[PDB]
Amino acid sequence: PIVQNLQGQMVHQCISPRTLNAWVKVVEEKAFSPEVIPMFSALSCGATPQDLNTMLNTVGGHQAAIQMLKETINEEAAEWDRLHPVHAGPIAPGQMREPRGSDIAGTTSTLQEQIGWMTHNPPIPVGEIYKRWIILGLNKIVRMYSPTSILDIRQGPKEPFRDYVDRFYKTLRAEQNAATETLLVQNANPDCKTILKALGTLEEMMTACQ
Amino acid sequence: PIVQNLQGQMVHQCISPRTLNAWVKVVEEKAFSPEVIPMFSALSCGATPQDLNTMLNTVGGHQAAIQMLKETINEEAAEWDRLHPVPIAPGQMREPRGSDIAGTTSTLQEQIGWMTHNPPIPVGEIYKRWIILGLNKIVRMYSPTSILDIRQGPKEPFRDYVDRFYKTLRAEQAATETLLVQNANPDCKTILKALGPGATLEEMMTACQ
C-alpha cells in the first residue's frame, strides 16, 4: 500500500505478510460471508492496484467467485473506458496520462504509474477506484452465495426469539429489505407473534419475547 | 529487501523471519498451486537477488521443481547474455550479466547498487521475472487434470462444478464459454443453452441453483 511516513511524505510500502495471510485465512474461514467485504476493504487500506491484484491472486479456490469478480471488473473497466476515452498526445511534464480502465485494474500499468496517480496533487486514487470495482463484484458474490431467503426464515418451535432475529437479519444482510418490520413479526412463533402484534423497537420487540 | 525507511532513503533490510516462514509454510501447504505464484511475488516484494535465492534455498523438498526452476533461470540468463553483451564510469556500475542478476557472480553490494541506481537496473525484479516464469511452468506441469476432463458430477452443485472448472483452467493456463456449458449436467446444461450466448457467469450460476 501507500502510506505516509514519519517524514510526512506519501510513500509506497510492501504488502505485509500479516496482511497477506490475514486475507487468505479470512477467505478460507468465512468464504464469502457478508463480513468478508469490510475485512477486504480494511486489509486493503491504501492498497495499490498491484496490491489489490495480489490479494485476489492469493485466493486459492473459489474460482467461480474469482471469475465472477473478473467479469465484474471487466464491466466497470469497460464503463470507465466509455466515460474516459483519453485524448492522447504529449502528456504534460509533471502530469500523468489519464488512466484507462485496464490501468486502474493494474494490468496495463506499472507500479510506478499507479503510485504516480495516487500520490499526484490532485490525486487520481486508482487504488480506491479499482477497490470500488472489487467490492462491487464481491457484493454480487455474497448475494449469490446467500444460502436461504428471508421468506424462508420462520421462528422454530422452541427457538429463542434472539436466535430467530439473529438468523433473520443475517439472511437479510446477505440478501439484497422492504418488509423487514412486517415479515419479522409475521414469521415468529404464535407465542411471540401475538405479543409483537399486541405492541403494534427491536429493543422493545426482544425484551417482549424473553 | 530494499525498502524506504522513515527518513526517505532506499536502504537494504534483512529478510524478515515472518516473510521467511510464511514462504516456507505456503510451499509446504500449497506445494505449487496457481496461488503460490503471487504469494511468492508478494513475499519477495523489493527483494534482492540474494533475498530471492534465500527464499528458494529455504524450500525443502520439491527438488524436481527446484531443478526445473534452475534450468529456466539458465535459459533466461543465457538469453540475457545474448541480448546484453558487456572500465566502468566513476558514477556508474558495470552492466550486469545473467549470472549477476541471478546473484551467483554478484555481491550484495553490487546488487544494491544496481537497484538503487538512478536510472536503476532492478536486478531484483529481473531475477524475479525469471523465477516467476519457471514457477508457472511448474504449476502448469503440476496441474493434475485437463480442462476437457472437467465434467459436472451427477448431483454436483453447479457452483462446485464451476469452481473446479476455473481452478483447473487457472492451473493449465479460448473455449471457456463453450466448454463450460458443454460439460454440465443435462439438468443445468439445458438451462444454460436456453439462455444462449452472451450470458454472464452470474446469470448462469443463478440459473442453476
Binding site: 492496484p49 498491484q50 489489490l52 491484484n53 495480489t54 485476489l56 491472486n57 471469475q67 473478473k70 467479469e71 471488473i73 471487466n74 473497466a77 469497460a78 480502465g101 485496464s102 485494474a105 493494474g106 494490468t107 496495463t108 | 496457481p34 505464484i37 503471487p38 476455473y166 483452467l169 487457472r170 493449465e172 493456463q173 471457456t176 464459454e177
Partner: peptide, 13 residues
C-alpha cells in the same frame, strides 16, 4: 475484456 478467464489479476495482455 480487461481480465480473461483463467488469467490472473494484473496479467499483461
Amino acid at each position: 475484456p480487461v481480465l480473461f478467464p483463467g488469467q490472473p489479476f494484473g496479467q499483461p495482455p
